[PDB]
Every structure is written in structure tokens, then in C-alpha cells.
């Protein structure tokens, strides 16, 4: 069976790496605004609907191609999404919009066992993102994999708090604390990236794009074999792999700025919680999507080999003192699109079995 | 000044608690063999160079984290050594070896006044243990503390009796009596744990890992302000805090199986010598390092508060009849690594002054 992955660290064998090509700035709408730092609002305000700076995209393409080269060198089989023009404007009976990109396979596909799951998504500009990955998915399907599509939302106004009070990150973070997010519980929605796998236990978080109905759908769909737990963090930010990236059996990277409220569950489990050192990325480099914390958004080739940013020396040193071989790759420009290694990939096959690490 | 501790009982304020992570079985060499009970020789023989049972380490981590929680609850500031992979094989011009762990800060750091002292050590597998604690030490240094490193040994064959006749604990104990230990006086070596502080008088013992040159170095380095005395016990075992743990001004816990030859010096001083009751730890529980006497290896939070093993009821009752509040913590699995509370910690700051308790 080509598809088989139970966690984030077993020996990687096959992976899907995204594409920076024809990426479009999403129209500046409520759920987009709730996910971007003030600094960039005018960019989305003016640039919305057009491609991301073509000069910048060209540098991303180059960086990702090298990443793919190294992956092949490391013995990993690389598959890529199809080239597609995300500038096309589509219209459903509920809304009209243009696309985003097929850069982050982690945002939309998650693999549990022999099953590949397409996430519903929660952004209008990402409604038809799955189109970019259907060729790969049908191929695995013909080859034996189980294939699932979570219920695609309508994404009607009813799913969004049209009056979500975000005017700064300080408004979002307080509301978040209050349990207030731009998405309602009108219908199931979620980004696969708010789920991180550890064998029989998957951990998820309610976020701007993943609501509780989304989490219960997953919980209800994978049970009894898999337990989906909900954990929360201080100053929550969507996509868990940049706040709590699990890198080994009982070893996790906990972002110092976003401490987990349930850290004790893991302390009691005899888990090693590592706090990575601060990122060194220049504040002048643009990250239209995400935060500087992409430095901890690492991809493990196995327990002892990590693919880390070539520029983040401090975190490189940490892995090394720990006995983990750093495979330095530079993707500074690819980061602007909103993600690091874990985000730009989706592990389709890892050599290993299903186990419990929470005891 | 962050660093300030003159004895083992003044109100604890800051402490360093070790780590069970990535601990490695030391290669079965002469000085290791001289410190282990026959029962475990085949474990070291086969397991040497690999990690201690990962399932067991996971339980230790959990137990130590709770200990840290309680310490924080008791108002003690906790610092921890850095995560490091002790499986790395290093090579000096005299020998080659893998590491052990940074579990016992007491084995390597001792605080006298405002000075923090790194012990030389005497095991090849512990040559580079100091690496785990340098971040903390440099921090205290920048903050005003005095920092000292005793002369690091070469640990050439010349330091060890390649033919030390140990074949059983009955051979070691007789030789010990004869003044025969696995270490020679080729060069200074010692474990800080063979020193127990009582204000102006520090007591030490010649042991498998602490030779007379080691003791004279300390004696000569701390004089005139501090007097380092050498005491001896029946059936000596390295690390004095499990044979003669000083718990208060003139109150000491004397292991019934290892009576002190100089007990009269203390009787004459008007000191209270308490003989703890026998341990109740199961003989089936593995203690790769140490003896069951870890039960008396207590850590005093102050004169009236002791952190004692949650399972050793008999010794708990003793402290209680004495008016000392027991703070029960369970570290049954952490004990296997070779130590109790006093061993898993190193008091950096205690509220008090330098005094004489020997009159």
C-alpha cells in the first residue's frame, strides 16, 4: 500500500511537496483579515486577487526545487500537486472568489494509517484547492489506499462572525482566550494542519479555521482506533505544527510564546518538552502568512534526521546537542507564503507501525 | 548574588534538578565494575553504550517533573541541565568513551558560599558531563557568582588499579577497609557527592571515585575559611549523602549498616546522631546504581521540611515524631539511575549565613 503513516517521525519514504506557482493573494475578507498581521492589511487590500509578487514567487520555486532534490537524495519519493492557475474566479451558490495556491499540502491533506483525508478548509479562497491534488490521490486509491473527503462546507456568511472585533493581534488573542474565533459552529470546517499525529493519539486545537464541529467530525470518524484530543495554548495561532510540533516518541517542541494549557498531561506521560530558541529571521523579510516561528516548523526524515532552515543557526545547534542530524535547506522566500518544512509537505508513507506513546 | 549556600538545611530558594533524558549505560570498565553489584554486571556487559531502558526512563522523567512541580509549589526556583545526547562517543588523547547522563547534579556541582565548584569526576563516561550545566553556570557567573573547575583528570590507565580484585561486594568492602580502591593517587579526582557541608566544616571520604589528592585539593582550595575533614565508615560506598546525610545544625542521619569510625568526634560535639529505619524498597526493583539506602538520601527544604520518598513510610514516621514535616514525593523509577532527592538536586541558594556547628 503506497499510503501508510501513523506519526510525524518514522523513516519517511514518500512525501508530497507543494507548489509556489501561480499563487494568488486571497481577497481581503473577514476570515483572511483574522489571520493576518496589521502590517500586511494594505497589501491584501490592494493586491487581493492578483498574484503574489512574481519576483518573489520565482525565488520560492527555486528554493522548493532544491528541497525536492535533497529529499530525493535522502531517499524520499517526491510527488507534487498539478500546476493550476489560482487566479480563476469561481462561484458557488453561497459566494464567489478567486483561489490561493497549492503550496501547503499539510493544510489540506492528512494521512492516518492507510487513509488519506482531504480537509474541508475554512477560507473561501481555498474552496477548490483539492483540485491540485486529485491526480496523486486517485493514483494512491487505485493502488489500494483508503480515501476520504470530510464534508465540504457551504462557507455561507453563517460560518463567519461578520463582526469579529479583530483590529490588531491583541484583539484576536483576547477573543481567542474567550473562545471567540472568526468561525462559528454553523458547520464543520478545519485545516488538516491543526492536527498533529502521535500514533493512536492525534492532537487538535480549536482555531480561526478549525471549529469544534470540525474536530468532533474527525474524532467521530477515526474512533475507536484513534483518539483525537483537544489541547489549547496561550496566544493561539492556527496550525498546530508551529506551536506544538511532535518530533519523536514522547519528544515535542513547545513554542515558548504559546505555552500549552495541558502541558501537565504530557509531563505526567514522561514526555520531553523542548523549548526551541528564538528565530533569527529579519523583521524586514515579509511573511504574508504565518509568524517567525516557522523555524520550529521542522520536518523529521526520521527520529535522528531533521530538515531545518539553513539560516536558523540557534535551533540547528539545539538539534545537534540532542544527537539529531540537521539537514539544512534554505527556504527563506518560500516561508513568506506561510510555511516551513512541515507545512510545505505531507508525508504519505513512513516505515513503521501504530503504537501509543501516551502510554 | 544568585549563588549562596553554606549548608544542607537553611531555607532553600534555588536548586538545579537533573535530567533522566538520553541517559546511557556506561561502558563496562574497571571503575564502573567496582561500583556495581554483581547482580547487574551482565546488564552493563550487554547494554553498555546503549540507553537505559527507554520505558524506564519515561517513568523517571514523569517522576522528576512532579518533583519539580512540588519544588515550585514550595517556593523553590528550579533550573535544569540542558538536554544532551549522552550516546555520543568522544575521544581524548588518553581514552575513548560514551557518556552517562546529567541526572545527578550533586555528583558534579557543589556550592560553598558564593562559589560554584565543578568536580573533576573519576569515570571516563563522565568526563564531559559539565557540558550539560554550563548555561546555568555562566548565567550565575554573569550575575556575580564565583566559578571554579577543579583540575580535570587525564583519566589515563594510571589512575585505575587495572587489577582491583573486586569479584563481589565482599572483596570491595575488605579492600576498602585496607585502604584499597579502584582509583590510585595518580592525580586528583573526586565526585562532589563525597562532600557534605555543615557551614565552616565540610566532611569528605576517600572512596572509589574520590581519592586523597582530590580531598587535599579541596582542602587546600577552601582553606583558611573552610575546614575539610576526612571521616570514614564501615563497608564504605561512594557518595557520602547516603551514609551520613547532615539534616540540621548538629543533627545527622547515620546509616546503620555503615557506622562512622569517628562518630565520637560528633558525640563529643553534642550532635544528635539518628539511625533511620530500614528501607522497604522491593528487592525486585532495579537499582543499576546505588543501594536501597537511597531512602535516607533526603533533601531538606529547611530545618523542619524534608522531601522524603512517598513509599518509605518507616522513615516518614521518624521525621514526623521529630517534628519535621514530610513532603512525600515518589521517585521510585528515578532511584534506579542511582539517586534520591539529595542526589537529583544541587542547592544553589539557601537563606542563611556561615557558622560553625562543631563549636
XYZ file of C-alpha atoms in Angstrom:
718
model
C 0.000 0.000 0.000
C 1.581 3.296 -1.020
C -0.145 5.261 1.736
C 0.921 4.499 5.291
C 1.893 6.985 8.038
C 0.990 6.827 11.747
C 3.100 9.637 13.142
C 5.427 12.524 12.387
C 8.827 10.778 12.897
C 9.106 7.233 11.441
C 11.524 6.834 8.440
C 9.983 8.926 5.670
C 9.619 7.166 2.313
C 7.163 9.212 0.220
C 6.024 12.803 0.508
C 4.046 15.434 -1.424
C 5.741 18.833 -1.720
C 3.627 21.873 -2.604
C 3.952 24.418 -5.397
C 4.529 28.169 -5.262
C 3.443 28.617 -8.911
C 0.524 30.943 -9.821
C -0.170 31.667 -6.163
C -2.800 34.430 -5.687
C -3.289 36.918 -2.882
C -6.628 35.954 -1.304
C -9.413 38.594 -1.455
C -9.314 40.564 1.774
C -12.273 39.044 3.602
C -13.118 38.595 7.305
C -11.501 35.152 7.842
C -8.413 36.318 5.959
C -8.179 39.500 7.975
C -8.470 37.469 11.175
C -5.361 35.550 10.124
C -3.062 38.386 9.071
C -0.902 40.856 10.990
C -1.871 44.544 10.716
C 1.377 45.276 8.918
C 0.028 43.449 5.831
C -3.607 44.543 5.640
C -2.880 47.200 2.987
C -1.084 44.558 0.873
C -4.144 42.344 0.845
C -6.322 45.426 0.464
C -4.624 46.479 -2.752
C -3.116 43.199 -4.026
C -6.101 40.925 -3.400
C -6.981 38.911 -6.486
C -3.577 39.273 -8.122
C -0.545 37.003 -7.935
C 1.947 37.245 -5.175
C 4.985 39.277 -6.355
C 6.203 37.263 -9.321
C 9.833 38.014 -8.476
C 9.291 36.563 -5.015
C 7.480 33.511 -6.372
C 10.417 32.761 -8.675
C 12.778 32.595 -5.676
C 10.318 30.275 -3.854
C 10.121 27.916 -6.822
C 13.906 27.705 -6.839
C 14.121 27.016 -3.081
C 11.443 24.327 -3.240
C 13.083 22.571 -6.184
C 16.287 22.230 -4.165
C 14.306 20.944 -1.231
C 12.930 18.305 -3.588
C 16.441 17.486 -4.764
C 17.661 16.941 -1.219
C 14.572 14.885 -0.429
C 15.345 12.622 -3.350
C 18.957 12.474 -2.167
C 17.705 11.384 1.231
C 15.830 8.518 -0.417
C 12.381 10.087 -0.151
C 10.000 9.774 -3.116
C 8.584 13.170 -4.027
C 5.182 13.796 -5.651
C 3.929 17.320 -6.458
C 0.488 18.864 -6.908
C -0.562 19.750 -10.512
C 0.130 23.188 -11.969
C -3.071 25.240 -11.830
C -3.885 28.914 -12.228
C -5.289 30.107 -8.939
C -6.458 33.386 -10.353
C -9.661 31.843 -11.764
C -12.785 33.201 -10.120
C -15.344 30.561 -9.233
C -18.825 30.983 -7.874
C -20.804 28.674 -5.657
C -24.418 29.333 -4.709
C -23.110 30.903 -1.487
C -20.148 33.055 -2.529
C -17.745 33.979 -5.310
C -13.962 34.126 -5.051
C -10.556 33.580 -6.587
C -8.043 30.941 -5.436
C -4.955 30.923 -3.222
C -2.316 28.206 -4.023
C -1.396 24.535 -3.588
C 1.708 25.429 -1.628
C 0.925 23.743 1.694
C -0.178 20.122 1.332
C -0.227 19.910 5.157
C -3.101 22.405 5.276
C -5.344 20.141 3.264
C -4.239 16.508 3.412
C -3.587 14.414 6.477
C -2.687 10.730 6.498
C -3.810 8.393 9.267
C -2.799 4.825 8.676
C -3.687 3.843 5.130
C -6.193 6.585 4.773
C -5.731 9.927 3.095
C -8.120 12.661 4.287
C -8.852 15.917 2.438
C -9.710 18.695 4.877
C -12.881 20.825 4.306
C -10.918 24.085 4.663
C -12.479 27.248 6.064
C -11.449 30.009 3.647
C -13.472 30.882 0.566
C -10.299 31.309 -1.467
C -9.389 27.711 -0.611
C -12.667 26.026 -1.554
C -11.306 24.244 -4.639
C -7.744 23.600 -3.520
C -8.248 19.848 -3.616
C -8.241 20.004 -7.432
C -4.470 20.396 -7.389
C -4.014 17.050 -5.573
C -6.599 14.720 -7.138
C -4.223 13.049 -9.637
C -1.952 11.924 -6.847
C -4.851 10.864 -4.673
C -6.544 8.832 -7.368
C -3.245 7.082 -8.066
C -2.861 6.006 -4.434
C -6.531 4.997 -4.473
C -6.096 2.722 -7.467
C -3.080 1.330 -5.617
C -5.039 0.416 -2.544
C -5.324 3.416 -0.266
C -8.486 4.474 1.560
C -9.616 7.940 0.509
C -11.800 10.329 2.465
C -13.174 13.824 1.984
C -14.526 15.498 5.128
C -17.834 17.322 4.444
C -17.133 20.360 2.255
C -18.680 23.455 3.938
C -21.038 25.838 2.228
C -18.980 28.681 3.639
C -22.077 30.857 3.771
C -21.884 34.054 5.833
C -23.323 31.973 8.637
C -19.931 30.322 9.167
C -18.206 33.658 9.943
C -18.619 36.308 12.676
C -19.075 39.211 10.280
C -18.316 41.443 13.263
C -15.277 39.605 14.710
C -13.625 42.555 16.537
C -10.097 41.983 15.321
C -8.291 45.295 14.784
C -4.939 44.036 15.995
C -3.347 40.784 17.132
C -4.146 41.976 20.692
C -7.863 41.780 19.954
C -7.647 38.320 18.315
C -5.580 36.891 21.201
C -8.017 38.070 23.889
C -11.069 36.856 21.980
C -9.325 33.584 21.311
C -8.859 33.333 25.061
C -12.559 33.983 25.413
C -13.200 31.139 22.936
C -14.070 33.691 20.265
C -12.932 32.957 16.736
C -13.847 34.243 13.305
C -15.551 30.891 12.591
C -18.807 29.801 14.134
C -20.090 26.324 14.727
C -22.531 26.781 11.852
C -20.964 23.733 10.107
C -17.817 21.548 10.215
C -14.671 23.236 8.949
C -10.965 22.745 9.658
C -7.427 22.775 8.179
C -5.617 19.443 8.488
C -2.689 21.436 9.880
C -4.448 21.907 13.250
C -3.956 18.145 13.805
C -0.575 16.622 14.755
C -0.203 12.826 14.860
C 1.359 10.647 17.523
C 0.215 7.129 16.698
C -3.098 6.320 18.411
C -3.461 9.859 19.720
C -3.977 12.825 17.432
C -3.997 16.266 18.957
C -6.020 19.134 17.661
C -6.849 22.697 18.554
C -9.851 24.949 18.010
C -8.599 27.818 15.860
C -9.638 30.563 13.493
C -10.109 27.893 10.817
C -10.819 24.711 12.788
C -14.012 24.789 14.846
C -15.314 22.241 17.349
C -17.671 20.631 14.832
C -14.646 20.047 12.599
C -12.788 18.374 15.484
C -15.791 16.221 16.512
C -16.228 15.100 12.920
C -12.615 13.835 12.924
C -12.944 12.415 16.407
C -16.098 10.592 15.390
C -14.681 9.376 12.074
C -11.424 7.832 13.389
C -12.706 6.351 16.634
C -12.364 3.733 18.159
C -8.906 3.146 16.661
C -7.743 6.716 17.110
C -8.204 9.212 19.901
C -8.398 12.854 18.855
C -7.641 15.101 21.849
C -8.141 18.860 22.050
C -5.362 20.913 23.607
C -5.073 24.678 23.861
C -2.275 27.184 24.035
C -1.638 30.742 25.169
C -1.997 33.333 22.355
C -3.305 30.699 19.928
C -2.412 30.895 16.225
C -3.873 28.466 13.628
C -1.989 25.353 12.540
C -0.582 23.399 15.435
C 2.745 22.411 13.812
C 4.165 25.852 14.595
C 3.210 25.736 18.275
C 3.486 22.093 19.250
C 5.475 20.132 16.692
C 5.847 16.493 17.830
C 9.288 15.280 16.650
C 9.739 11.876 18.249
C 8.178 9.280 20.546
C 7.442 11.456 23.556
C 9.525 14.418 22.426
C 7.802 17.623 21.467
C 8.836 21.167 20.518
C 6.776 23.684 22.511
C 6.857 27.266 21.244
C 7.944 29.435 24.207
C 5.438 32.191 23.320
C 2.452 29.803 23.141
C 2.578 27.518 26.191
C 0.068 24.632 26.281
C -2.555 24.717 28.986
C -2.467 20.955 29.220
C 1.322 20.584 29.366
C 0.834 18.538 32.522
C -0.854 15.718 30.628
C 2.465 15.245 28.807
C 4.685 15.892 31.813
C 2.808 13.126 33.562
C 3.331 10.914 30.469
C 7.105 11.181 30.778
C 7.358 13.269 27.648
C 10.313 15.533 26.888
C 9.108 19.085 26.184
C 11.811 21.115 24.418
C 11.536 24.889 24.029
C 13.344 25.968 20.847
C 15.478 29.117 20.872
C 14.121 32.300 19.286
C 14.004 32.681 15.483
C 16.596 34.916 13.855
C 14.626 35.778 10.685
C 14.875 39.510 9.788
C 11.806 41.573 10.648
C 12.083 43.136 7.197
C 11.539 39.824 5.420
C 7.835 39.554 4.535
C 5.724 36.733 5.942
C 2.324 37.498 4.423
C 1.106 34.431 6.207
C 2.404 32.984 9.489
C 4.914 34.142 12.083
C 8.662 33.962 12.520
C 8.093 30.741 14.434
C 8.280 28.803 11.201
C 11.804 27.944 12.378
C 10.355 25.189 14.608
C 8.034 24.052 11.833
C 10.521 21.245 11.073
C 10.068 18.040 9.072
C 11.593 14.863 10.539
C 13.072 12.408 7.996
C 13.294 10.024 10.954
C 13.994 10.194 14.673
C 17.558 11.414 14.177
C 17.379 13.417 10.917
C 15.600 16.737 10.787
C 15.234 19.144 7.866
C 15.774 22.580 9.448
C 16.136 26.073 7.986
C 19.699 26.710 6.821
C 19.541 30.225 8.314
C 18.257 29.371 11.792
C 21.566 28.508 13.401
C 20.369 28.563 17.048
C 17.735 25.875 16.519
C 20.269 23.876 14.434
C 22.605 23.805 17.415
C 19.806 22.553 19.634
C 19.035 19.569 17.455
C 22.729 18.824 17.298
C 23.303 18.837 21.074
C 20.409 16.377 21.096
C 22.006 13.981 18.614
C 19.751 14.857 15.699
C 21.442 15.334 12.328
C 20.465 18.658 10.761
C 19.727 18.667 7.023
C 19.953 22.370 6.336
C 17.860 23.690 3.488
C 17.137 27.324 2.686
C 13.543 28.318 2.048
C 13.536 31.892 3.225
C 11.381 33.058 0.344
C 9.062 30.041 0.474
C 8.351 30.959 4.128
C 6.575 34.160 3.010
C 3.778 32.071 1.549
C 3.074 30.965 5.105
C 5.017 27.860 5.953
C 8.117 25.899 6.730
C 9.067 22.316 6.013
C 6.244 20.617 7.840
C 3.765 22.889 6.026
C 5.230 22.530 2.545
C 4.959 18.722 2.833
C 2.566 15.869 3.612
C 4.086 12.509 4.443
C 2.356 9.772 2.501
C 4.471 6.844 3.724
C 6.727 6.291 6.742
C 8.189 2.956 7.709
C 6.576 1.829 10.975
C 3.502 0.665 12.941
C 0.635 2.062 15.013
C 1.523 2.486 18.681
C 0.681 4.518 21.756
C 3.209 6.975 23.121
C 0.966 8.415 25.803
C 1.298 5.001 27.473
C 24.154 37.140 44.327
C 22.174 34.194 42.982
C 24.599 31.616 44.364
C 24.769 31.292 48.135
C 24.614 28.088 50.229
C 26.667 27.236 53.337
C 24.986 24.049 54.482
C 22.405 21.386 53.733
C 19.436 22.753 55.779
C 18.873 26.547 55.553
C 15.641 27.660 53.730
C 16.110 26.512 50.140
C 15.458 29.163 47.486
C 17.012 27.909 44.227
C 18.010 24.442 43.108
C 19.135 22.561 39.984
C 17.275 19.307 39.301
C 18.846 16.744 36.965
C 17.519 15.078 33.827
C 16.839 11.419 33.076
C 16.672 12.071 29.302
C 19.030 10.238 26.885
C 20.827 8.544 29.764
C 23.335 5.888 28.570
C 24.581 2.736 30.245
C 28.292 3.374 30.872
C 30.752 1.019 29.095
C 31.602 -1.784 31.490
C 35.060 -0.703 32.620
C 37.070 -1.278 35.823
C 35.877 1.793 37.800
C 32.296 1.060 36.761
C 32.571 -2.570 37.760
C 33.971 -1.512 41.133
C 30.784 0.475 41.723
C 28.136 -2.055 40.710
C 26.593 -5.066 42.441
C 27.245 -8.476 40.842
C 23.561 -8.825 40.053
C 23.932 -6.139 37.344
C 27.257 -6.960 35.695
C 25.590 -8.791 32.781
C 23.338 -5.749 32.192
C 26.329 -3.474 31.809
C 28.120 -6.216 29.895
C 25.430 -6.398 27.237
C 23.750 -2.968 27.495
C 26.883 -0.823 27.744
C 26.819 2.020 25.240
C 23.058 1.972 24.752
C 20.358 3.950 26.536
C 18.876 2.820 29.763
C 15.527 1.062 29.099
C 13.518 3.770 27.378
C 10.320 2.639 29.096
C 12.015 3.079 32.460
C 13.437 6.473 31.513
C 9.955 7.701 30.586
C 8.694 6.902 34.103
C 11.716 8.728 35.614
C 11.060 11.835 33.534
C 7.486 11.861 34.794
C 8.522 11.451 38.455
C 11.133 14.200 38.209
C 8.719 16.635 36.570
C 6.353 16.239 39.521
C 9.231 16.738 41.900
C 9.901 19.997 40.072
C 6.242 20.947 40.368
C 6.253 20.411 44.119
C 9.526 22.304 44.420
C 7.964 25.260 42.667
C 4.935 24.897 44.938
C 7.263 25.041 47.915
C 8.643 28.342 46.632
C 11.916 26.928 45.322
C 13.230 28.178 41.965
C 14.115 25.248 39.728
C 16.781 25.269 36.990
C 17.539 22.179 34.863
C 20.575 20.991 32.915
C 20.368 21.209 29.070
C 19.081 18.293 27.005
C 22.055 16.441 25.524
C 22.523 13.072 23.865
C 24.851 11.067 26.050
C 25.346 8.379 23.471
C 27.995 10.409 21.602
C 31.414 8.793 21.701
C 34.244 11.194 22.426
C 37.953 10.571 22.417
C 40.647 12.253 24.436
C 44.339 11.526 23.946
C 44.061 9.050 26.836
C 40.823 7.141 26.238
C 37.613 6.926 24.236
C 34.111 6.532 25.644
C 30.422 7.326 25.504
C 28.541 9.411 28.096
C 26.332 8.655 31.095
C 23.709 11.360 31.986
C 23.153 14.710 33.710
C 20.804 13.153 36.227
C 22.693 13.868 39.454
C 23.792 17.492 39.795
C 25.077 16.618 43.297
C 27.716 14.331 41.777
C 29.298 17.175 39.876
C 28.474 20.561 41.390
C 28.941 21.671 44.961
C 28.273 25.153 46.309
C 30.336 26.664 49.111
C 29.359 30.202 49.908
C 29.107 32.185 46.694
C 31.232 29.778 44.793
C 30.097 27.028 42.481
C 32.608 24.185 42.020
C 32.552 21.622 39.194
C 34.015 18.313 40.339
C 36.729 16.584 38.203
C 34.831 13.266 38.237
C 36.607 9.915 38.109
C 34.725 7.902 35.476
C 35.607 8.031 31.794
C 31.932 8.045 30.856
C 31.518 11.207 32.937
C 34.396 13.244 31.507
C 32.202 15.758 29.659
C 29.224 15.889 31.996
C 29.848 19.536 32.806
C 28.608 20.463 29.316
C 25.036 19.895 30.455
C 25.348 22.567 33.188
C 27.401 25.364 31.600
C 24.431 27.557 30.576
C 23.233 27.740 34.145
C 26.724 28.280 35.478
C 27.555 31.068 33.071
C 24.295 32.785 33.994
C 25.150 32.773 37.704
C 28.656 33.925 36.775
C 27.391 36.929 34.850
C 25.199 37.597 37.884
C 28.083 37.699 40.290
C 28.941 34.195 41.412
C 32.468 32.817 41.748
C 33.034 29.846 39.456
C 35.614 27.109 39.848
C 36.593 23.961 37.985
C 38.803 21.534 39.921
C 41.624 20.138 37.725
C 40.113 17.811 35.115
C 41.969 14.444 35.265
C 43.537 12.756 32.289
C 41.908 9.535 33.423
C 44.776 7.561 31.934
C 45.104 3.906 32.957
C 47.465 5.178 35.617
C 44.506 6.448 37.652
C 42.965 2.951 37.966
C 44.108 -0.340 39.556
C 43.631 -2.423 36.425
C 43.765 -5.440 38.735
C 41.443 -4.232 41.538
C 40.327 -7.653 42.888
C 36.627 -6.930 43.083
C 34.589 -10.037 42.244
C 31.867 -9.333 44.770
C 30.882 -6.613 47.228
C 32.725 -8.722 49.853
C 36.013 -8.149 48.047
C 35.447 -4.381 47.611
C 34.487 -3.925 51.288
C 37.599 -5.698 52.602
C 39.931 -3.850 50.238
C 38.222 -0.609 51.117
C 38.997 -1.449 54.728
C 42.579 -1.996 53.673
C 42.525 1.459 52.031
C 42.368 -0.190 48.616
C 40.193 1.454 45.998
C 39.895 1.234 42.240
C 41.437 4.728 41.994
C 45.063 5.492 42.650
C 46.633 8.718 43.755
C 47.997 9.207 40.243
C 46.099 12.546 40.029
C 43.261 14.459 41.755
C 39.799 13.049 41.144
C 36.544 13.143 43.115
C 32.722 13.363 42.907
C 31.268 16.383 44.708
C 28.851 13.940 46.344
C 31.575 12.622 48.692
C 31.467 16.046 50.414
C 28.648 17.076 52.789
C 28.510 20.667 54.074
C 27.993 21.928 57.598
C 28.977 25.587 57.477
C 32.699 26.036 58.190
C 33.295 22.293 58.258
C 32.906 20.122 55.187
C 33.251 16.394 55.588
C 34.611 14.109 52.957
C 35.513 10.482 52.493
C 38.070 8.621 50.400
C 36.058 6.419 48.049
C 36.149 4.506 44.802
C 35.863 7.843 42.985
C 37.318 10.369 45.436
C 40.996 9.865 46.249
C 43.153 11.662 48.812
C 44.650 14.028 46.234
C 41.100 15.073 45.352
C 40.349 15.774 49.029
C 43.622 17.689 49.601
C 42.934 19.798 46.530
C 39.579 20.837 48.052
C 41.077 21.231 51.495
C 43.820 23.414 50.076
C 41.472 25.448 47.878
C 38.888 26.401 50.549
C 41.214 26.965 53.488
C 41.505 29.027 55.715
C 37.781 29.847 55.638
C 36.655 26.245 55.410
C 37.869 23.087 57.080
C 37.543 19.902 55.045
C 37.682 16.868 57.360
C 38.041 13.234 56.320
C 35.815 10.695 58.041
C 35.444 7.001 57.301
C 32.734 4.418 57.651
C 32.326 0.659 57.876
C 31.639 -1.013 54.485
C 32.221 2.258 52.615
C 30.178 3.073 49.499
C 30.840 6.203 47.367
C 28.858 9.403 47.868
C 28.550 10.392 51.489
C 24.928 11.638 51.369
C 23.674 8.052 51.562
C 25.764 7.171 54.614
C 25.990 10.373 56.613
C 23.380 12.878 55.493
C 23.568 16.026 57.668
C 19.992 17.358 58.050
C 20.241 20.146 60.600
C 22.580 22.060 62.908
C 24.138 19.161 64.778
C 21.665 16.543 63.590
C 22.833 13.824 61.265
C 21.382 10.647 59.739
C 23.851 7.771 60.168
C 23.197 4.692 58.038
C 23.017 1.727 60.454
C 24.971 -0.544 58.069
C 27.851 1.936 57.622
C 28.821 3.259 61.064
C 31.362 6.119 61.154
C 34.707 5.398 62.732
C 34.878 8.932 64.034
C 31.359 9.066 65.488
C 32.932 10.160 68.761
C 34.055 13.477 67.303
C 30.353 14.286 66.856
C 29.188 12.712 70.105
C 31.657 14.958 71.863
C 30.273 17.925 69.859
C 26.792 17.403 71.276
C 25.447 16.273 67.938
C 22.300 14.178 67.562
C 23.045 11.030 65.536
C 19.824 9.454 64.235
C 19.779 5.961 62.730
C 16.995 5.739 60.130
C 14.835 2.614 59.950
C 15.458 0.076 57.182
C 14.328 0.789 53.599
C 11.247 -1.016 52.329
C 12.051 -0.853 48.588
C 11.349 -4.188 46.803
C 14.430 -6.262 46.013
C 12.984 -6.798 42.541
C 13.086 -3.098 41.695
C 16.318 -2.413 39.780
C 18.901 -0.006 41.171
C 21.592 -0.148 38.489
C 23.463 2.345 40.576
C 23.358 2.743 44.368
C 21.763 0.782 47.193
C 18.368 0.652 48.842
C 19.673 3.225 51.299
C 18.550 5.987 48.984
C 15.636 6.309 51.422
C 17.855 8.389 53.750
C 19.213 10.371 50.817
C 16.750 13.157 51.721
C 16.688 16.815 50.671
C 15.868 19.373 53.384
C 13.770 22.372 52.253
C 14.623 23.810 55.671
C 15.148 22.565 59.209
C 11.560 21.366 59.562
C 10.587 20.375 55.993
C 12.070 17.316 54.366
C 11.362 15.851 50.929
C 11.196 12.087 51.563
C 10.217 9.135 49.372
C 6.443 8.684 49.284
C 6.905 4.902 49.590
C 9.277 4.800 52.563
C 6.705 5.015 55.324
C 9.007 3.990 58.221
C 11.456 6.840 57.655
C 8.485 9.224 57.149
C 7.237 8.339 60.614
C 10.657 9.046 62.073
C 10.828 12.556 60.698
C 7.320 13.139 61.954
C 7.989 12.033 65.547
C 10.850 14.523 65.332
C 8.657 17.443 64.278
C 9.811 17.533 60.671
C 7.106 17.947 58.032
C 7.368 15.251 55.364
C 6.864 16.332 51.746
C 6.254 12.968 50.152
C 7.255 12.606 46.533
C 7.508 9.385 44.550
C 10.655 8.783 42.538
C 10.870 5.027 42.591
C 11.926 4.825 38.965
C 14.305 7.790 39.189
C 16.108 5.913 42.004
C 17.276 3.246 39.519
C 19.551 5.794 37.890
C 21.413 5.883 41.190
C 19.996 8.527 43.457
C 17.406 10.039 45.709
C 16.448 13.628 46.377
C 19.786 14.876 47.602
C 21.440 13.328 44.524
C 18.952 14.585 41.949
C 19.483 18.165 43.197
C 22.132 20.793 43.938
C 21.122 23.706 46.126
C 22.264 26.959 44.587
C 20.797 29.318 47.198
C 19.659 28.889 50.807
C 18.745 31.742 53.092
C 21.374 31.977 55.844
C 24.969 32.684 56.962
C 28.280 30.897 57.519
C 28.597 29.413 61.001
C 30.286 26.639 62.937
C 28.217 23.779 64.290
C 31.131 21.749 65.587
C 31.516 24.533 68.167
